[PDB]
Amino acid sequence: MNFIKDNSRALIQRMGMTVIKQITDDLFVWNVLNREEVNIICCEKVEQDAARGIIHMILKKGSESCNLFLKSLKEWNYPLFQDLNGQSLF
Amino acid sequence: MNFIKDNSRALIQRMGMTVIKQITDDLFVWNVLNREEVNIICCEKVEQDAARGIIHMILKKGSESCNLFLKSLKEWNYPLFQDLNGQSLF
Amino acid sequence: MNFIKDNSRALIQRMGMTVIKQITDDLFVWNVLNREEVNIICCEKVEQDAARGIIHMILKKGSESCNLFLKSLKEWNYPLFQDLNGQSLF
Amino acid sequence: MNFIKDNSRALIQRMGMTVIKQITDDLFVWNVLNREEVNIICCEKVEQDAARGIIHMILKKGSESCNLFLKSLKEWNYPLFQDLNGQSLF
Amino acid sequence: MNFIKDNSRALIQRMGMTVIKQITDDLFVWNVLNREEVNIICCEKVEQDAARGIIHMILKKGSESCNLFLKSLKEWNYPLFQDLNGQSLF
Amino acid sequence: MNFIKDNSRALIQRMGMTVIKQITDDLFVWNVLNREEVNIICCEKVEQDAARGIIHMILKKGSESCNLFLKSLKEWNYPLFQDLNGQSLF
Amino acid sequence: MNFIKDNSRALIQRMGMTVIKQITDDLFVWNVLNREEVNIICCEKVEQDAARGIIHMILKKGSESCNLFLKSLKEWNYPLFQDLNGQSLF
Amino acid sequence: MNFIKDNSRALIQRMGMTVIKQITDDLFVWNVLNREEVNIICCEKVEQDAARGIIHMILKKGSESCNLFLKSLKEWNYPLFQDLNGQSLF
Amino acid sequence: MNFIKDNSRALIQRMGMTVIKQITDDLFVWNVLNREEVNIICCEKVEQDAARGIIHMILKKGSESCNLFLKSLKEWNYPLFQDLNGQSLF
Amino acid sequence: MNFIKDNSRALIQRMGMTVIKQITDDLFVWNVLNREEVNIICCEKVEQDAARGIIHMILKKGSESCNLFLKSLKEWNYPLFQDLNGQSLF
Amino acid sequence: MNFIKDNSRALIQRMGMTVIKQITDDLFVWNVLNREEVNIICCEKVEQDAARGIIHMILKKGSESCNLFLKSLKEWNYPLFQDLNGQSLF
Amino acid sequence: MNFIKDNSRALIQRMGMTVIKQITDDLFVWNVLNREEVNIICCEKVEQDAARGIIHMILKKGSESCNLFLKSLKEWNYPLFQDLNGQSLF
Amino acid sequence: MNFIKDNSRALIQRMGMTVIKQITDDLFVWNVLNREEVNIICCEKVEQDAARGIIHMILKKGSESCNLFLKSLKEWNYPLFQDLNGQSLF
Amino acid sequence: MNFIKDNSRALIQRMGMTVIKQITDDLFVWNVLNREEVNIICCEKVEQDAARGIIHMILKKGSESCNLFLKSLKEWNYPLFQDLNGQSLF
Amino acid sequence: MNFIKDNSRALIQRMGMTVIKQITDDLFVWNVLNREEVNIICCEKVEQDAARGIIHMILKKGSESCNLFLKSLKEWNYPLFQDLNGQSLF
Amino acid sequence: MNFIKDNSRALIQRMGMTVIKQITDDLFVWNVLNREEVNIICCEKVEQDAARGIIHMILKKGSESCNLFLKSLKEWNYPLFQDLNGQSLF
């Protein structure tokens, strides 16, 4: 997927730590993240480092992992997702 | 948005804890804040840390989230908002 | 405003609970206090804590809020106000 | 439930402390509130903080807890409930 | 309603304890006050605190509760009501 | 003023309820007491609590309020005043 | 156990801090939690972080620890448990 | 005991302050209430808050404390007790 | 000691705030609690959090501290103690 | 001083609210209590909480403050003082 | 300054919360404390933690800040100050 | 020892950070770990890396170090140990 | 010193956060702890991590630092110290 | 700039966490700090590590960044700044 | 490009780790860096080694890669860029 | 210098990370350490590796660098320094 990669600047800089943890939780439940991968994203004291961890990880895990990432990103951080897609807020 | 950022000094130092919680409530109802984001703003025992949380969060969430922030800021803490805009009290 | 701040020692220690509630009422009517801010000043079982609440709050809310504070302070607790300004009682 | 959430602004700002305690009592009797949850709602010296406690709590506890909340809200604070639903007073 | 709020200074300072209890009674009969709300207004040893209780309570309970408040206020304390409205005594 | 404070033991224990109400009346007429402050001194079912109310209040209101307090105390309860000053009865 | 894991989204977002502490207490008494594990769940200023702590911890501690977790979850937060199992409130 | 809990709505709203004080006295004599617990029930200026205090307290103190509570409740406020049990007045 | 730990569920949920403060006082006098430990137990606005504080603290302080805890618990909250030990009320 | 501390159980449980206020007054006049400390002891609706406030406060303020405390305690509540010292009533 | 540091044991354990808030107020007025520093000292629910906050803060802020601290400490908590300096009470 | 090695999958993935630190502490006290080895296990921000550190280290240190490891593992994380040995929870 | 090390299990698990902070304060005053070392012990949200910090630190700082540690440990947490030394409570 | 570097000992050891956050805020608004740089200074649980972060960062960012740093340092922590410059307090 | 090379002293010594990671991110999105090259820059525990990695890498990748490097360097670390170009801060 | 080298065992094992960072800071200010050398000492996640870095570095940098090292070591970690020199604590 290119949408993550193309906007990975914004995604790294804008996804809250909360958003990252929650996406991570959904992804763990959906069996695209190892508990270690979860813990390594979550252990970063810095937001943006956790963001880099998750983004590069998901990009390496293929189209479907990326689709799931964007699914839960839309759910948990709808404002950012709509802003990235040039869409308004509803 | 730059108005938040440019005045973020004053906003951090002057928004009451009340003002922060109330803005947060409006924003949650308006679906720009995750309940976790709400709880993390609200859990800060310090006013100004809650203020930093909300401000940086909203700045990361784009123009529309910032507009909504300023909308409810005007409502709930009209004196501060008018003072920031160099306006009198009505 | 500096008059509040410079004399905030005396204001905290000397404004009666009554004086605080009444100032608070005028300020609420004059739309410089949120009902929550009112309730939080009023809920302090201690006089001086209510005083601190109102004083720091008004200082954060700018010149005009401070002017209104001193207006109603003069009205409701004229003796204290005149004593702070080095004035006699009329 | 969305009715609570959509109107949670008004509910936080308008439910009296009495209304909150009484709803809490009904809900405890109806076994949707732990005695601790009761005590934590009740221990807030501020009305609106107790309101936030109960509202977010009930929203997390699902549709049926929310229905019971609105049931007792209608009973104990009928005026507010009718005003929220755009209804007159009978 | 704004008439209560705008004149809440005068209403707090001028409604007799009697006037407050009687308004409260009418309002209880008219089902805008919980017996607890009645008891909490009535238990204030201070007139003006009871006044604050009733006024803020009714303001939170909406337009119709406020209209009923002013109805019975006109009945039981007609002099004050006419003085607030800039009217003479008949 | 120190005379009130130094003798506040005796003043609390010895000023009759009558003496307190009357001093309060003079002070209200002389515009050092808010009607609420009057009502709060007067509402104490206990003499000595009313005494504490007035004494601490006047001490907070400065030298001139204290002078007026002692003026009317001399008038209305001359025996106590002379006993405090180590003076005889005339 | 999969029930915890499959619903861990809801469990993280919905278990009150109270519910977490109480489950933790039962589990400590039942000797599936070290006092440190207790303190680390309890020290999170954020509800959902405490929830993540307990959930991942219990999942790592096996079937029986998970069964005990769900036992006390049913006791202390019966509404949530029934909502997760698609059951009504009794 | 469930009878107290199930009817705690009615008990909170209907036990007179008198009834509460008297039950409290019997319970103190019967050594199920600490003098502090007595004073804390009695110090509530509001009836229903005293009622909540006693009810939750007794529920926490077990079956026998609850039985004694209902014993003296039957004695001192027989009408309420019979109304709760669906019984007539003798 | 295991009696505290085994029943710590009940002890947390049932010891009144009064009971906790009083036990704390006895324990401070008996030199098993630092004044800070006293203040930290007492500062919890929630009963059960104060209970957790004292219980975990005393468990960490050994057999004799636990024995003293149960001694004063028997004194000040005899009903609970007898209920925990499966004993009747005398 | 140890006499206060050793008997602080009895002092907390037995000093009347009156005794506490009066001791507090003497101590304020004797310049060992800040008016705020006075107001905080006096604002406790519960006797024993006021007692705890004064006792811990005076213990922190040293030998001489404690001596003055016991002086006025002997004066105002001579029966309790003699009972604590194992002395009869004269 | 060494006097604060050498006696910081006693200062932490003995300065009342009141004393801390009042010193803090004087220091804020005297422009050695940021409003945030004020709020962070004041937000500690524990006395001694607030004490640690202020003490370490003032020690870091140099000789003159420490001198001002001791000035207002002498004013507001004269008994403690004299006890630390091995002086009697006047 | 083979029990560690054979189950090292589970041990790496399931031992809490707490469990690791505590085992490490016991082992340091029992003189099978250098303070550096302690610090290197403890410095891993990731649980599982700390787990790998301790496990491989202990395996290299022989039968007795492994026996001690399993001893303290049984103590501090009894649930995991029993689950690994196919045993129930007591 | 070996007494700390041999009992460091118990010391880590049993020293209250209070005990740790207070020991730390004494040690800072006694010039065996850098203010940073103080802040790093104090910043641990977990009790036992603060305990590990102080214990390993003091062990590295030699016999005299350890003696001072045990001195203040005896003072501030006498019960634990006596329990470790197999001594009773006095 | 050399003033920062020469006094970086004192600056690291004396700038409060508050001072650091506030300087950081001004600098972010003044566009000498990336939001990540802000978050990395702010995420240090230790004051002095945050201080090191900001100081070394600003030194690397040149004369003008250093001038701005000292500007806001003078504003927010005037006492420290004057002490470093060998100046008194005004 | 020579601007990078000529100033590579300053660039190595002054670009924050943050600046390096962010430039790296932009460059990866702009398809001048392989994910491995990203990971190798990012894996350096030392700032300046990461700086050397990126600088030499980009110099080898030609004029356009260097132009993009300087583009994002201007964006993310504008102060350094302006200082290198002998320009002021805007 | 031989004192460092001869005791480098103890220095590596006993200098806290804090002590190392602080020495490093003094040495950087005193122009015996390159900012890179600072960052490389500071980047070691392990205390003792940072210690080795600084010690070997300073030994290579000659007598005067070693003298400065021991100067600041005496300042910041006086206990260790006195223990190494066979001296007591003052």
Q: What is the 3-state secondary structure (H, E, C) of chain J?
A: CCHHHHCHHHHHHHCCHHHHHHHHHHHHHCCCCCHHHHHHHHHCCCHHHHHHHHHHHHHHCHHHHHHHHHHHHHHHCHHHHHHHCCCCCC
Question: E52 and C25 in contact by Cβ < 8 A?
Answer: yes
**Half-sphere exposure (Cβ direction) of J23: Cα atoms closer than 13 Å:** 32
Q: How far is G56 from chain I (nearest CA, A)?
A: 23
**Beta-strand runs (E) in chain B:** none
Cα distance between residue N17 and residue N23, in whole Å = 10
**Residue type present at position K55:** I
Locate tokens 């109107």: which residue?
A: D7
**Residues in B touching N21 (Cβ below 8 Å):** 48, 52
Q: Which residues contact P70 (CB under 8 A, 6 or more apart)?
A: P1, P3, P4, P81
Please state the domain count of chain I: 1
Locate tokens 């045990």: which residue?
A: M70
Residue A8 near residue O25 (C-beta atoms within 8 A)? yes
Kindly report each contact of residues G30-33 with a partner whose C-beta sits within 8 Å and lies 24 or more positions away, as own/partner.
Answer: G30/G68, G30/L89, G31/L78, G31/L79, G31/L89, G31/L90, G32/G58, G32/G61, G32/G64, G32/G65, G32/G68, G32/L79, G32/L89, G33/G57
G51, G53, G55, G58 alpha-carbon torsion, rounded to 10°: -140
Nearest by CB to residue I61, choosing from M22, M79, M88, is M79
Cα distance between residue N65 and residue N59, in whole Å = 8
Cα distance between residue L65 and residue L58, in whole Å = 6
K72, K78, K83, K85 alpha-carbon torsion, rounded to 10°: 50
Residue D47 near residue C39 (C-beta atoms within 8 A)? yes
Interface test with N, best of B9, B13, B14, B48 (most N CBs within 10 A): B9
Which stretch of DSSP H or E encloses residue I56?
Answer: helix I47-60
Q: Which residues contact C87 (CB under 8 A, 6 or more apart)?
A: none
**Residues in L touching G60 (Cβ below 8 Å):** 13-16, 80
**Residue type present at position N26:** D
**Residues in A touching O29 (Cβ below 8 Å):** 5-6, 8-9
Question: How many CB atoms neighbour CB A59 within 10 A?
Answer: 17
**Residues in M touching N46 (Cβ below 8 Å):** 36, 39-40, 43
DSSP annotation of K30 reads T
Interface test with H, best of E28, E35, E46 (most H CBs within 10 A): E35
CA E60, E63, E65, E69 torsion-angle sign: positive
J2-26 b/e (C-beta count within 10 Å ≥ 16 → b) = eebbebbbebbbbbebebbbbbbbb
Residue N63 near residue K44 (C-beta atoms within 8 A)? no
Which three-class secondary structure state does DSSP give residue I45?
coil
- DSSP string covering C19-87, please? HHHHHHHHHHHTTSS-HHHHHHHHH-SSHHHHHHHHHHHHHHTHHHHHHHHHHHHHHHTHHHHHHHTT-
CA G40, G41, G42, G48 torsion-angle sign: positive
Comparing CA positions, the residue from C52, H60, N80 lying closest to residue I9 is H60
Record the tokens describing residue B79, joined without a space. Answer: 């004196």
Helix axes B35-43, B47-60, angle to 10 degrees: 150
Burial of H1 (C-beta count, 10 Å sphere; 0-12/13-18/19+)? middle
**Containing domain of residue K86, as a range?**
1-90
- DSSP string covering P13-31, please? HHS-HHHHHHHHHHHHHTT
Comparing CA positions, the residue from A28, B85, K60, L57 lying closest to residue N51 is K60
Record the tokens describing residue C50, joined without a space. Answer: 């209510």
Comparing CA positions, the residue from O24, O59, G81 lying closest to residue N36 is O24
Residue N83 near residue K63 (C-beta atoms within 8 A)? yes
Cα distance between residue K70 and residue K75, in whole Å = 9
Cα distance between residue J61 and residue L39, in whole Å = 44
Q: Which residues contact G3 (CB under 8 A, 6 or more apart)?
A: G66, G70, G84
Comparing CA positions, the residue from M60, P73, P4 lying closest to residue L36 is M60
CA P66 to chain centre: 9
Q: How far is J40 from chain K (nearest CA, A)?
A: 9
Question: F9 and J21 in contact by Cβ < 8 A?
Answer: no
Cα distance between residue K20 and residue K11, in whole Å = 10
Comparing CA positions, the residue from D12, D8, D29, D40 lying closest to residue D72 is D29
Question: N60 and O83 in contact by Cβ < 8 A?
Answer: no
Subunits close to B (at least 3 CB pairs below 8 A): A, C, D, G, K, N
Locate tokens 């945030």: which residue?
A: K36
**Residues in B touching G46 (Cβ below 8 Å):** 36, 39-40, 43
Alpha helix (H) ranges present in G1-90?
Answer: 3-6, 8-14, 17-29, 35-43, 47-60, 62-76, 78-84
Question: N36 and A45 in contact by Cβ < 8 A?
Answer: no
Q: How far is H44 from chain J (nearest CA, A)?
A: 8
Question: I25 and J9 in contact by Cβ < 8 A?
Answer: yes
- DSSP string covering H32-80, please? SS-HHHHHHHHH-SSHHHHHHHHHHHHHHTHHHHHHHHHHHHHHHTHHH
* Experiment type: cryo-EM
Cα distance between residue C54 and residue O61, in whole Å = 63
Cα distance between residue O46 and residue E90, in whole Å = 89
Residue L33 near residue L56 (C-beta atoms within 8 A)? no
DSSP annotation of D7 reads T
* R_g (Cα) of chain F, nearest Å: 12
Q: Which residues contact E2 (CB under 8 A, 6 or more apart)?
A: none
Which three-class secondary structure state does DSSP give residue M89?
coil
Nearest by CB to residue M16, choosing from I31, I57, I64, is I57
Question: How many CB atoms neighbour CB O34 within 10 A?
Answer: 11
**Residues in B touching A83 (Cβ below 8 Å):** 61-64
DSSP annotation of F77 reads T
**Residue type present at position K62:** G
Record the tokens describing residue D52, joined without a space. Answer: 């936030």
Do K and I share at least 3 CB pairs under 8 Å? yes
**Residue type present at position I70:** L
Residues of B with CB under 8 A from a CB of D: 21, 25-26, 28-29, 35, 38, 42
CA distances from B16 to B22, E82, H41 (A): 10, 39, 35
Residues of F with CB under 8 A from a CB of C: 30-32, 34, 36-37, 40, 57, 60-65, 68
CA N33 to chain centre: 12
CA O60, O63, O64, O70 torsion-angle sign: positive
Q: What are phi and psi of G80, to 5 degrees?
A: -60, -45
Burial of N2 (C-beta count, 10 Å sphere; 0-12/13-18/19+)? exposed
3-state DSSP percent of chain M in helix, strand and coil, to 5: 75, 0, 25
DSSP annotation of F76 reads H
Nearest by CB to residue B8, choosing from N21, N25, N42, is N25
Comparing CA positions, the residue from K81, K83, K27 lying closest to residue K53 is K27
Nearest by CB to residue P45, choosing from L35, L36, L43, is L43
Question: H36 and J45 in contact by Cβ < 8 A?
Answer: no
Residue C8 near residue C65 (C-beta atoms within 8 A)? no
Q: Which residues contact L15 (CB under 8 A, 6 or more apart)?
A: G60, L23, L47, L51, L73, L77, L80
Do A and N share at least 3 CB pairs under 8 Å? yes
Helix axes H62-76, H47-60, angle to 10 degrees: 140
Q: Please, what is the end-to-end C-alpha distance for chain I in angstroms? A: 26
N44, N47, N49, N53 alpha-carbon torsion, rounded to 10°: 80
CA I53, I56, I59, I61 torsion-angle sign: negative
Cα distance between residue J73 and residue I7, in whole Å = 41
Which three-class secondary structure state does DSSP give residue B1?
coil
Nearest by CB to residue L29, choosing from M8, M48, M52, is M8
Closest-CA residue of chain M to K51: M25
H73-88 b/e (C-beta count within 10 Å ≥ 16 → b) = beebbeebbeebeeee
Closest-CA residue of chain H to J17: H39
**Residues in H touching J15 (Cβ below 8 Å):** none
Counting every residue written for chain F, the total comes to 90
Record the tokens describing residue I58, joined without a space. Answer: 């005393």
Residue C71 near residue C32 (C-beta atoms within 8 A)? no
